[PDB]
Amino acid sequence: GTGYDLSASTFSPDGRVFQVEYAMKAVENSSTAIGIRCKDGVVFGVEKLVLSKLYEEGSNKRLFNVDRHVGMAVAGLLADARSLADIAREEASNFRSNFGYNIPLKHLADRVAMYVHAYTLYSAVRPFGCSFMLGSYSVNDGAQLYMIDPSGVSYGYWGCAIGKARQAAKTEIEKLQMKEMTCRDIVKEVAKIIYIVHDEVKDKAFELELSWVGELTNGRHEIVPKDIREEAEKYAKE
């Protein structure tokens, strides 16, 4: 503390970077998220606090489309999250322009994690206050899902959660048996887990932003049709 947690370039006496240790606290404080790799795809899901009913239908959505087959579910400081999503979109576009075809998810996650590490390495710039999952599917490489901490590195996840209640979500995620369940029931189950996570116990009403990618969508990461997934929300309510 004191003089060591002032700039990211200052190492702790024990050998730690306290700026990122505090940036992780913003992710821990912001709303939670969940992403599950189904048998033939990856299903996302994020609850979003409607801080006031003055807002329209779900805006500043935690889900983003960084590429044609790749989607990003982010939590934490949302402005820097959107800036990082723009960075990821630019990286995917550059890779498609240079090497053709579609950017593999592992390489995209590695590059964006390296960019985040570059931002947390120096002193003038500050570490990003956001953690996100990158999910994509392809016929060749199946379904992948990588999660990036505000300072850490991408890690392969069968199913991951980040935000306010990580352990509470992860317990039921590990309770759920993935790797053999189709993405439909996985949408139902991610909605169920999010509603199991507390929504109105001490906060306002929450909206359910759920994303899709898989062979059922032949790649092409898109937001699940909310009109037909309201019944999945109803099953989650029960």
Binding site: Y22, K25, L54, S59, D80, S83
Partner: protein, 237 residues
């Protein structure tokens, strides 16, 4: 408190303090409301006056025929944002001859304002923006805070004592889509009038109206143009 000195540094408890102080810049400013309808977007801004001799300053800035903004807070780095938005919209006109959709413009503003929140020696743009635009999906109202986290809103207000206007809009937001132009403008006027103390009241000289519609390009109405809307005020200070 050490950790509150600079924007780059991060507080141990979580979010940084400089941006939280930045949101107080919009809090310390004249009130302004902005509401959507089925076909129109209307901004009602309180033209704060220095003295009776001086004018009531300028609010509800003009961006393009279909986009108009209302500032609230630090006026220095607000004309800069207005210039940036004007330049981006004109670039869109110059490249593909179409009105720049409001959502993309707001995303550009958020991305542009995000960088100062991370670059050392650069203060965040402590300006609250109430952007009114009419893209192909009807009217749109967006709120841009200095935290670079924009929001879409059916009806939002920012400024000093704007919480009362927020509550009035929320209680009356159900009957907003099906309202005539004059009816919606009167809703906004009632919302703004509820912000000031009972001594203050709406005048033709201290209020500004910005209306954009399907067939109506963005227009900044003032005293003579406001008087037809100001009639039927139903004054309950």
């Amino acid at each position: 408190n050490q950790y509150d000195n600079d924007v780059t540094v991060w507080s141990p408890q979580g979010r940084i303090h400089q941006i939280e102080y930045a949101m107080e810049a919009v809090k310390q400013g004249s009130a302004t409301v902005g509401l959507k309808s089925k076909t129109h977007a209307v901004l009602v801004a309180l033209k704060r006056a220095q003295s009776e001799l001086a004018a009531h300053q300028k609010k509800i800035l003009h961006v393009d025929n279909h986009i108009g903004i209302s500032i609230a807070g630090l006026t220095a780095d607000a004309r800069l944002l207005c210039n940036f938005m004007r330049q981006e919209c004109l670039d869109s006109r110059f490249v593909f001859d179409r009105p720049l959709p409001v959502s993309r413009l707001v995303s550009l503003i958020g991305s542009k304002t995000q960088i100062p929140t991370q670059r050392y020696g650069r203060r965040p743009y402590g300006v609250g923006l109430l952007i009114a635009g009419y893209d192909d999906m009807g009217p749109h109202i967006f709120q841009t805070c200095p935290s670079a986290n924009y929001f879409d809103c059916r009806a939002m207000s920012i400024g000093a004592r704007s919480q009362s206007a927020r509550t009035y809009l929320e209680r009356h937001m159900s009957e907003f889509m099906e309202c005539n132009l004059n009816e919606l403008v009167k809703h906004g006027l009632r919302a703004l009038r509820e912000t000031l103390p009972a001594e203050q009241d709406l005048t033709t000289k201290n209020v500004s109206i910005g209306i954009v519609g399907k067939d109506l390009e963005f227009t900044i109405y003032d005293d003579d143009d406001v008087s037809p809307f100001l009639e039927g005020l139903e004054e309950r200070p």
